[PDB]
Write a protein that binds this DNA or RNA. Structure first.
Ligand SMILES: Nc1nc2cc[nH]c2c(=O)[nH]1
Ligand SMILES: [Zn+2]
Length: 376
RNA sequence: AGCACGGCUUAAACCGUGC
């Protein structure tokens, strides 16, 4: 079985569908990877996650590092064994926390010093350390250590941040390659930065391509610049990346975001939207989002979504789920999440099939229509 | 507490607005 083999089977405009073959499994693309930060996809058993259609879930480096600890998971047999998910797992470097936890952070050329957001203890997360942790966890797709540049950002900050990241990228590549045990079984992705300035984006892309990575991700987006700006940056950023390699857009969920991103060449997505919203009561459907807490659902026997093939939608009504979330019942979170994730998978199935039939561009158009119409 | 809603792009079974 191959280590990492990306193959495009169909194309349409910038969009394309295919698969990534890895030792632990195959990953159909475009793909959506559910987020399982602390060694768990919130409120779901691994089998449930797999049931929705996911081929790969994602774990977080910074968080697992703190709890239950990298070395400890390594000792317990690795992340896969630990949480009960044997298919490929992608671990994020922690470069996202560098931003979301800025307040508790202290940056330096060596790496970023984090103050445990739960222990107060100090921790040095350098490119090398980030890669060692990912090795200890035994992830299949390793992410380079980077700094998800905050937004807005002056061309100056965005440039220094990006350049330090590219240097961090090289260090990551070296850390990865130092362990043959790792380099022979995992895959390494680099992350492109540069905020919303294309000259910077190009520059970052070139550094990345020079070092050489199994896959290239685009970071720094969906961080407050809005969909218009995002799609605009993607317009020129994705083409700067190696066409024969997979393109990964980090932290991007929200039905229409994904569809547009795919129209621009993205192959992979990861986002907390479906799981967090599921927990808060927000369900995603072919007719836009719907807040199940709303009064109009107290006696609505219909399922969350009319088309949805998901297990929740085959059995329970909006009325039951309404009651649940309102009551504070955990089953409520469970049901909501399973649905949002199966829907995200069904949406990905659709996006893949349309590209195969050469009628994706259309599918996108019909999608927004119905979605933004909100007749659920 | 509760009600009517909103937000969410893992320090979030959360946070906010109005009664
Ligand atoms: N490492 C990393 N993770 C994420 C997640 C979302 N955006 C980013 C990013 O720019 N870098
Ligand atoms: Zn469903």
């Amino acid at each position: 079985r191959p280590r990492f083999s990306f193959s495009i089977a169909a194309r349409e405009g910038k969009a394309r569908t295919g698969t990534i073959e890895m030792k632990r499994g195959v990953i159909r693309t475009p793909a959506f990877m559910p987020v399982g930060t602390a060694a768990t996809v919130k409120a779901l058993k691994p089998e449930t996650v797999r049931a929705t259609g996911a081929d790969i879930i994602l774990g977080n480096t910074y968080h697992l590092m703190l709890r239950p600890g990298a070395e400890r998971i390594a000792k317990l047999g690795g992340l896969h064994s630990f949480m009960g998910w044997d298919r490929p797992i992608l671990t994020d470097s922690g470069g996202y926390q560098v931003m979301s936890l800025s307040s508790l952070t202290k940056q330096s050329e060596e790496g970023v010093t984090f103050k445990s957001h739960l222990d107060g203890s100090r921790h040095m997360l350098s490119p090398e350390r980030s890669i060692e942790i990912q090795h200890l966890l035994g992830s299949d797709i390793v992410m380079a250590f980077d700094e998800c540049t905050p937004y807005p950002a002056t061309p100056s900050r965005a440039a220094s941040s990006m350049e330090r990241s590219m240097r961090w990228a090289k260090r990551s590549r070296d850390a990865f390659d130092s362990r043959k045990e790792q380099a022979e079984n995992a895959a390494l992705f680099g992350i492109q930065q540069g905020s919303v300035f294309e000259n910077l984006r190009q520059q970052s892309a070139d550094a990345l391509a020079e070092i050489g990575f199994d896959g290239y991700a685009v970071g720094g987006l969906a961080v407050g610049e809005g969909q218009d700006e995002m799609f605009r940056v993607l317009d020129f950023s994705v083409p700067m990346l190696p066409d024969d390699k997979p393109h990964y857009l980090m932290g991007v969920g929200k039905p229409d975001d994904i569809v547009g991103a795919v129209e621009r060449g993205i192959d992979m997505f990861d986002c907390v939207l479906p799981t967090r919203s599921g927990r808060n009561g927000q369900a995603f459907t072919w007719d836009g989002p719907i807040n199940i807490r709303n009064a109009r659902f107290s006696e609505d026997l219909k399922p969350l979504d009319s088309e949805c093939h998901c297990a929740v939608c085959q059995k329970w009504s909006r009325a039951y789920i309404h009651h649940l979330i309102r009551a504070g019942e955990i089953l409520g979170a469970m049901l909501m999440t399973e649905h949002n994730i199966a829907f995200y998978q069904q949406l990905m199935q659709k996006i893949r099939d349309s590209i195969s039939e050469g009628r994706f561009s259309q599918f996108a158009q019909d999608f927004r229509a119905r979605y933004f119409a909100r007749n659920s």
